[PDB]
Amino acid sequence: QVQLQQPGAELVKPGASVKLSCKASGYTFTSDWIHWVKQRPGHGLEWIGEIIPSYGRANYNEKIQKKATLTADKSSSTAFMQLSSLTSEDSAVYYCARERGDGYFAVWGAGTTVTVSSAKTTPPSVYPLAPGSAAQTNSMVTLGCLVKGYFPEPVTVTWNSGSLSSGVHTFPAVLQSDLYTLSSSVTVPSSSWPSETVTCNVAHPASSTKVDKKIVPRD
Amino acid sequence: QVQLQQPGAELVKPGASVKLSCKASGYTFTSDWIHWVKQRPGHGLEWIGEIIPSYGRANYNEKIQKKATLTADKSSSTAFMQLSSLTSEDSAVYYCARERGDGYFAVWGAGTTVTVSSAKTTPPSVYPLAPGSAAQTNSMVTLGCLVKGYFPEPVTVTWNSGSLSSGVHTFPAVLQSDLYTLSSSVTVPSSSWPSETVTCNVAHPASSTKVDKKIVPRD
Amino acid sequence: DILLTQSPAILSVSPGERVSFSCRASQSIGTDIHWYQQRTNGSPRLLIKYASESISGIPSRFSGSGSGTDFTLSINSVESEDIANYYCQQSNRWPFTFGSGTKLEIKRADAAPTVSIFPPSSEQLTSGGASVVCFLNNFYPKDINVKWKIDGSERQNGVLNSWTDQDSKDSTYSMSSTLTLTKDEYERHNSYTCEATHKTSTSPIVKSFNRN
Amino acid sequence: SALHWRAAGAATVLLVIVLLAGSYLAVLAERGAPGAQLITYPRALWWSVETATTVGYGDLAPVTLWGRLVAVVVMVAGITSFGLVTAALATWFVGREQERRGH
Ligand SMILES: CCCC[N+](CCCC)(CCCC)CCCC
Ligand SMILES: CCCCCCCCCO
Numbered sequence: 038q039v040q041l042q043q044p045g046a047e048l049v050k051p052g053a054s055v056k057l058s059c060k061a062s063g064y065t066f067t068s069d070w071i072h073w074v075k076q077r078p079g080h081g082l083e084w085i086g087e088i089i090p091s092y093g094r095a096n097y098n099e100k101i102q103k104k105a106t107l108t109a110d111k112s113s114s115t116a117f118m119q120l121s122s123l124t125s126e127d128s129a130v131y132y133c134a135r136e137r138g139d140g141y142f143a144v145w146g147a148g149t150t151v152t153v154s155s156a157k158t159t160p161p162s163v164y165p166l167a168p169g170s171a172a173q174t175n176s177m178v179t180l181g182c183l184v185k186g187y188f189p190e191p192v193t194v195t196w197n198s199g200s201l202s203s204g205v206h207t208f209p210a211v212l213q214s215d216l217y218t219l220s221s222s223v224t225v226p227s228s229s230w231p232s233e234t235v236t237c238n239v240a241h242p243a244s245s246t247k248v249d250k251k252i253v254p255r256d
Numbered sequence: 257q258v259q260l261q262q263p264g265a266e267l268v269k270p271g272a273s274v275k276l277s278c279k280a281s282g283y284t285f286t287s288d289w290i291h292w293v294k295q296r297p298g299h300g301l302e303w304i305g306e307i308i309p310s311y312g313r314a315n316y317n318e319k320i321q322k323k324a325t326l327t328a329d330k331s332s333s334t335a336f337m338q339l340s341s342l343t344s345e346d347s348a349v350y351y352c353a354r355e356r357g358d359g360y361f362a363v364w365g366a367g368t369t370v371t372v373s374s375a376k377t378t379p380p381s382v383y384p385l386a387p388g389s390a391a392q393t394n395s396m397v398t399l400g401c402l403v404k405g406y407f408p409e410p411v412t413v414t415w416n417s418g419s420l421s422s423g424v425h426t427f428p429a430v431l432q433s434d435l436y437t438l439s440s441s442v443t444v445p446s447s448s449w450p451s452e453t454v455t456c457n458v459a460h461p462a463s464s465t466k467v468d469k470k471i472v473p474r475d
Numbered sequence: 476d477i478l479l480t481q482s483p484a485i486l487s488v489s490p491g492e493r494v495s496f497s498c499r500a501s502q503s504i505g506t507d508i509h510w511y512q513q514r515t516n517g518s519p520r521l522l523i524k525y526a527s528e529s530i531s532g533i534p535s536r537f538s539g540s541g542s543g544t545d546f547t548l549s550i551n552s553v554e555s556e557d558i559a560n561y562y563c564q565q566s567n568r569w570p571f572t573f574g575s576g577t578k579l580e581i582k583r584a585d586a587a588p589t590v591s592i593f594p595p596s597s598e599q600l601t602s603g604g605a606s607v608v609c610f611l612n613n614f615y616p617k618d619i620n621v622k623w624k625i626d627g628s629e630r631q632n633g634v635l636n637s638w639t640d641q642d643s644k645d646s647t648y649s650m651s652s653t654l655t656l657t658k659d660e661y662e663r664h665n666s667y668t669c670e671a672t673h674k675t676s677t678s679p680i681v682k683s684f685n686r687n
Numbered sequence: 688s689a690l691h692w693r694a695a696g697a698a699t700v701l702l703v704i705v706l707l708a709g710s711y712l713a714v715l716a717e718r719g720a721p722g723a724q725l726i727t728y729p730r731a732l733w734w735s736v737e738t739a740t741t742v743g744y745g746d747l748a749p750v751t752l753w754g755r756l757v758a759v760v761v762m763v764a765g766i767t768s769f770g771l772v773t774a775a776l777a778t779w780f781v782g783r784e785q786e787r788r789g790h
Pocket of ligand 1: 739740741765766769770
């Protein structure tokens with residue numbers, strides 16, 4: 038089972054506040070410390086703060102601007118980080134990590150992509166990508182899914198509920214008028230399609246919408 | 257109340273000696289240390305020495321030339337720094353600070369501007385500065401006071417006993433034949449003058465003379 | 476003794492931006508560094524004690540960080556009141572030593588100077604002297620030139636100028652130009668002119684007065 | 688109250704006075720010596736405690752003559768006071784063992 042469970046994303050207006058979560062499972066001792074690490078797109082890891090849930094004391098990085106408040110709830114084994122007065126500089130991926138009081142972060146969470154914007158949440162649109170009627174196919178065949186018009190990030194696209202990962206490319210999104218757009222590639226052998234079904238699973242946690250889309254040939 | 261009280265200025269002849277003061281008020285403990293810091297015009301802070309009044313031991317900066325002797329008087333809660341054989345290199349602003357024996361200087365004094373010169377003390381002359389008869393005035397109006405022919409420094413000029421500080425400029429003095437000269441600007445709304453009085457308070461501690469001067473319009 | 480280097484000596488920051496001051500110690504002093512603020516013609520004021528501890532009365536925008544040899548004083552969203560010199564001081568080893576100091580200056584928008592000319596008053600003419608004072612107040616940038624014309628002819632003799640540091644109330648600069656003459660020389664002329672050429676205007680800002 | 692318990696309590700109070708006086712006199716002795724770190728009272732008190740207990744971490748140490756003479760007094764006062772406590776415990780155990788033996 039996953040040890041630290043974080044939400045997918047949180048859309049915050051400029052100046053508004055948000056409270057992130059990090060549900061802990063597995064072995065829990067009185068010597069546990071929950072840490073929070075901030076990582077902006079195109080930057081390294083940045084230590085935010087720590088908290089010991091068995092006592093409630095929280096420490097914070099004194100080099101950076103203090104915009105966080107760390108709480109803990111022993112009844113539900115969940116730590117919380119409350120971010121206040123957010124600007125674009127606060128838009129990053131926020132991980133939580135568990136330290137057994139011996140220095141290193143043995144387990145990390147998936148991280149919550151926090152996007153500070155003035156826009157609005159838009160679920161994505163998924164479109165099949167099949168080769169045209171005139172297309173010579175080799176021993177393999179490439180299919181795709183087009184995820185366009187979503188905000189904010191991220192989107193997690195899988196192929197056949199994750200059972201298909203080899204030969205899968207997912208290109209980074211491009212921002213176009215407060216909307217993101219990406220595509221995902223998959224390369225199955227030519228004999229396996231369309232006999233064996235090929236679907237893409239586009240999950241957009243910011244809108245709580247996960248959508249499938251089968252790739253059937255054109256005519 | 258002010259915690260450390262120092263004189264305004266002291267004029268010393270080259271080679272003569274002077275004794276500065278620093279009257280202490282507020283909470284006084286046996287762990288108090290009085291420090292002295294020297295700051296020449298256009299230079300940083302320079303530690304001179306320390307003294308513990310509850311015992312009388314004084315330490316001095318061993319990097320610089322020792323020209324000071326620190327005493328203390330517990331009956332009047334006043335520390336004294338005796339400077340001997342002063343040259344132009346000793347002309348500076350001398351602050352006193354109180355340290356509670358824990359490292360930092362929690363409170364500073366106003367400082368005594370010590371000027372080592374061969375000249376003579378001259379009180380200043382204050383002159384009104386009102387716009388001429390032909391002068392178009394906008395929503396505001398600027399008045400002034402001319403402080404010329406004084407020695408030595410400094411002069412503390414206030415407007416209406418300090419009640420007027422917004423829109424007040426006081427230019428640094430210029431030395432002209434062993435005499436200083438500066439001006440002070442004040443910008444009140446045009447409607448408020450001359451209905452509401454506007455005066456400048458020029459205090460010259462070196463001569464123990466504080467002079468007021470009202471700014472009335474010309475004819 | 477312990478050396479405290481503060482580099483650079485001057486930091487230029489636009490309004491509303493974070494600014495960090497650096498203080499490096501010649502040897503490790505743990506967290507025994509203390510920060511002070513000194514405005515123009517003012518006494519030093521304690522801002523941060525023991526590297527990162529707050530002081531009562533100091534605004535919330537002031538903070539500190541670091542331990543060992545490198546220490547930082549940070550100001551979140553700089554304001555005009557923050558224009559001053561900033562010193563660090565160590566208390567780990569005797570004697571206590573100070574840093575050389577770092578000045579903070581603000582890059583505000585360009586502002587045209589407000590020029591004012593003042594004739595000599597009656598109390599000065601009776602002493603045999605006269606001074607025409609010109610106030611060049613609240614301009615940005617700091618570069619400015621004043622020109623004195625007596626009866627249309629340029630005057631450069633006996634003109635003392637005086638610039639102020641950056642104003643801690645509005646981040647601007649101010650200048651005073653004073654031409655001093657005797658009562659006789661002042662009465663042998665009529666027109667006195669103060670001209671201020673500034674970056675904010677291709678044409679000079681001119682203020683004059685006549686004895687009529 | 689028996690002597691050995693009264694003497695222990697007296698030794699504890701005396702030790703606190705030595706710690707406080709030792710912290711004050713160390714700062715008074717160490718300031719003026721370049722490089723000295725025993726120059727502020729809060730850590731001087733911490734140094735005095737770890738001296739009387741003879742722990743001696745090494746984070747703080749006196750360099751002057753009178754600062755080290757203060758240290759010597761703190762050392763002796765700490766060793767003696769804790770030794771008197773041990774001596775009082777021995778008397779308690781021996782006195783209890785006499786009653787346990789009927790004698
Ligand atoms: C567990 C602490 C024991 C430390 N002692 C006695 C305490 C005195 C404060 C040091 C005496 C040294 C004079 C005994 C060590 C004997 C090896
Ligand atoms: C051991 C006696 C106490 C030390 C005497 C005071 C410290 C010397 C100050 O110069």
